[PDB]
Amino acid sequence: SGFRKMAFPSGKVEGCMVQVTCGTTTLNGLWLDDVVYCPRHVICNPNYEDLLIRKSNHNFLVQAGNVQLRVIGHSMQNCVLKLKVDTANPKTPKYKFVRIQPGQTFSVLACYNGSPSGVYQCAMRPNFTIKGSFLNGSCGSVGFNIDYDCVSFCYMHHMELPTGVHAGTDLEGNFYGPFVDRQTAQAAGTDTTITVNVLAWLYAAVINGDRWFLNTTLNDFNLVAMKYNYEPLTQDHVDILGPLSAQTGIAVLDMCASLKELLQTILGSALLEDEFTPFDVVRQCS
Amino acid sequence: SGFRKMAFPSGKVEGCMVQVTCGTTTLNGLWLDDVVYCPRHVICTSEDMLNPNYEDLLIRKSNHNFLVQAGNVQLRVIGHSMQNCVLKLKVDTANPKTPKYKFVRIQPGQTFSVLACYNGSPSGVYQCAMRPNFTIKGSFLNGSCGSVGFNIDYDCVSFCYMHHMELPTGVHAGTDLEGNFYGPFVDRQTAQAAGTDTTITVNVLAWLYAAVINGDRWFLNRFTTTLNDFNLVAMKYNYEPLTQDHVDILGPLSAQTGIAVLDMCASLKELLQNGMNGRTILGSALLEDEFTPFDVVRQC
């Protein structure tokens, strides 16, 4: 029994974290094969082509624990700097670079100047920010999921927005959300609540004994959801919640009706949590 | 900025997780140097869940009765002994991945990270607090026995917890690595239940300091309070008594924010009195108590 904001074990990613210094900026890098990946703002209204063109390879200090790596080439892909080094990481996991959707979750290994300090579980918000926890020096920390010993890297941290939330890119350097790597007047848009994750979480509650909220149509549920700032529930979502209806014996629309009543504690919270995907609930409540 | 129930990186502990099988009972084990540690109830059968005699059960065992596996590798057991509720299996091979480590026993209100494992395979990591009633509100399924809890000082892992059982209320009970249970619990499957739990007062106060550090002061007021008046009120909300030791511990957070501990206590009294009024503190509508003053400083 029990239910927790549980992160993936982090050892496979810990073995890939290095420290990257350029000039007066130090941040984190991800060392896979013979390439270190880090935010391109390590070289800083900037002109990133001119900034990189004037850099030589010995202007990048890559410190892998107690061993300095020799940079033998530097390139750039979208917002990410790619540093080629003289040695391949012997600890490189089976990995792929993926890009995730809002509503999907991933684990974040917060590192500070190369050294992992803590791991936690996040969701990509509908406004493409993440409500994480990052202090100075945490730029370049990565987010990931693990599936049968393959690490799917989905996020690299770049910056904090003035509302205390965080913005970054995938590992190909493409930003999540309408953000740019300039220290300028940027702000998150109006957020919304992830309906399918709330419903999956309610399913976790009945699996773990909380049933006091149990009691519609998809069309009437969505009419109230739009007034409570909830994402519209699609049939894709309804089908995805199928396995939880099958395990708990509660139709998706019945759970929607219960959610409607709640909008008009569970699993230890006074708020309707929405950072657990249907997959997360099953993996943990198997 | 931001604030999460952040766990320690788990790689140093993942490299120590193994699978221990005795008869048809399988659980997880902790492999450090040439010793595998696991709950002693691995040697129980279906006939003696209720009143097992562990001394008698163990003397009937040979080393080859214990099947221990590190991934694909079977480890050779060359000896076995018992220390309280933990079984210690000596093996022919020392763990090449042994981190620097200590065995520690934590106090209630202290936090640690749990690496949840099944069949020696880690599946996830999360953050726990030792409740005043000596249980933890974890997330464990069948097969999770032997999973361990820990903290990391720098490169040294302090192991403080090994999981043994789930109580009828849903909470979880276990031992330190000496095999001594946290709380009045025994590794028998007779009816046991946790005592009345309470809220960890010093942790709520630390967390209110964290909220101030991250920019929120709306819950403060112009009042102060004596320590005893505070406890007289807080205990009516089922809070743990706040001791001068706790007040001393909150010192660094008080100095950092300029808010005296007892002034923050006065705020807590009002929050208990009034509620959130539709607001949140660090993203929660409840008063969180699973962050120690040391956790707050480290994350802030």
Ligand SMILES: CC(=O)N1CCNC(=O)[C@H]1CC(=O)Nc1cccc(Cl)c1
């Ligand atoms: C993470 C870290 O170690 N640091 C150094 C100290 N301060 C910081 O802000 C960061 C660097 C940073 O964010 N730079 C930047 C530059 C150009 C545009 C944008 Cl968006 C960001």
Ligand SMILES: CC(=O)N1CCNC(=O)[C@H]1CC(=O)Nc1cccc(Cl)c1
């Ligand atoms: C956790 C785990 O992996 N398993 C193996 C499969 N089945 C289980 O029951 C457990 C072991 C267990 O809890 N047994 C037990 C026996 C006597 C007293 C007490 Cl307290 C507990």
